[PDB]
Amino acid sequence: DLLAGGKDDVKATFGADSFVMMCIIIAELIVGVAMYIRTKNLLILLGLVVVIVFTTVGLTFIK
């Protein structure tokens, strides 16, 4: 059988609605605008979108 195996709730800690998933997404926003202002090209504002989908489709592979 499995040991240490536990709980999982660790998943709920890092999961969909979380504190860490909430700060990791807000940093993408705030330094996304930063690296935009210093440059002014737009692929970087789109760089926020790839974090939205990545975390979303990423978290479903945890199970």
Ligand X SMILES: CCCCCCCCCCCCCCCC(=O)OC[C@H](COP(=O)(O)OC[C@@H](O)CO)OC(=O)CCCCCCCCCCCCCCC
Residue ranges in contact with ligand X by CB under 6 A: 20, 23-24, 26-27, 30-31, 34, 37-38, 40-50, 53-54, 57-58
**Which residue has its beta carbon closest to ligand X?**
38
16 contact choice in ligand X, a second copy, none (CB below 5 to 8 Å, kind-dependent): none
Q: How far is the CB of 15 from a second copy (least distance, A)?
A: 8
The closest of 46, 13, 41 to 29, measured between CA atoms, is 46
27: left (phi over 0), alpha (psi -120 to 50) or beta: alpha
DSSP H or E run through 16: none
